[PDB]
Amino acid sequence: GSPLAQQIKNTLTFIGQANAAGRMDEVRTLQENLHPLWHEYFQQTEGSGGSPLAQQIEYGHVLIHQARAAGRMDEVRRLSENTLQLMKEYFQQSD
Amino acid sequence: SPLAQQIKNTLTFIGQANAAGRMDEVRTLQENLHPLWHEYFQQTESPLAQQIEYGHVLIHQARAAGRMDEVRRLSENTLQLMKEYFQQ
Numbered sequence: 001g002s003p004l005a006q007q008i009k010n011t012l013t014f015i016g017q018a019n020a021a022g023r024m025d026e027v028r029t030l031q032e033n034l035h036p037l038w039h040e041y042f043q044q045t046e047g048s049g050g051s052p053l054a055q056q057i058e059y060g061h062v063l064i065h066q067a068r069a070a071g072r073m074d075e076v077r078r079l080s081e082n083t084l085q086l087m088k089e090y091f092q093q094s095d
Numbered sequence: 096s097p098l099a100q101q102i103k104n105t106l107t108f109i110g111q112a113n114a115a116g117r118m119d120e121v122r123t124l125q126e127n128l129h130p131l132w133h134e135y136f137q138q139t140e141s142p143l144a145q146q147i148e149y150g151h152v153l154i155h156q157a158r159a160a161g162r163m164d165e166v167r168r169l170s171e172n173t174l175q176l177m178k179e180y181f182q183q
């Protein structure tokens with residue numbers, strides 16, 4: 001995988017441990033640490049022609065920002081879990 | 096507000112990187128500044144603040160679409176608005 005892929009993969013389990021446990025400030029810290037690095041990757045790898053899987057992950061991210069802004073923590077947690085599970089699998093397709 | 100202060104610090108870091116031509120760092124710092132703005136806004140939320148919040152929303156949507164022309168345009172605009180917000 002590209003070096004940015006290896007970098008992203010390293011943080012994914014920890015985001016899900018935090019989210020599952022309802023450590024929502026930790027989930028947000030870890031996501032925000034990831035934000036520039038997922039976007040750099042997504043631009044280089046997916047661009048304006050993302051696969052439906054990659055695009056669903058990135059739409060999840062957009063919708064996480066919107067939920068968090070609205071304080072809708074139920075949606076922050078649900079979207080974070082679903083988006084994480086898809087990202088983990090996206091980064092395994094070469095497996 | 097230490098969030099305000101981090102933002103101010105990051106704005107300066109951006110101007111230092113841009114003076115050196117460290118453009119990957121500029122773009123990275125601009126992206127660090129997105130969640131940090133939202134945290135600030137969600138802690139203090141002015142019309143200008145609201146325009147900055149929308150600028151980040153729109154940058155994100157443009158990036159998700161691959162409209163890097165719009166990412167570039169909106170980022171430039173939003174950066175200036177933040178500088179102005181913290182210059183009052």
Ligand SMILES: C[C@H](C(=O)O)c1ccccc1
Pocket residue numbers: 056057059060063078079082083
């Ligand atoms: C996970 C969530 C949903 O299940 O509603 C979702 C919908 C559309 C795009 C991304 C995520």
Ligand SMILES: [Cl-]
Pocket residue numbers: 031032033035130
């Ligand atoms: Cl984030």
Ligand SMILES: [Cl-]
Pocket residue numbers: 062065066151152153155156
């Ligand atoms: Cl956003």
Ligand SMILES: [Cl-]
Pocket residue numbers: 039129154155156158
């Ligand atoms: Cl963004």
Ligand SMILES: [Mg+2]
Pocket residue numbers: 010011
């Ligand atoms: Mg590791």
Ligand SMILES: [Mg+2]
Pocket residue numbers: 088089092
């Ligand atoms: Mg798997």
Ligand SMILES: [Zn+2]
Pocket residue numbers: 031032035061065130
């Ligand atoms: Zn984000």
Ligand SMILES: [Zn+2]
Pocket residue numbers: 039058061062155159
């Ligand atoms: Zn995104």
Ligand SMILES: [Zn+2]
Pocket residue numbers: 065129130133151152155
């Ligand atoms: Zn945002």
Ligand SMILES: [Zn+2]
Pocket residue numbers: 035039126129130154155
């Ligand atoms: Zn961003």
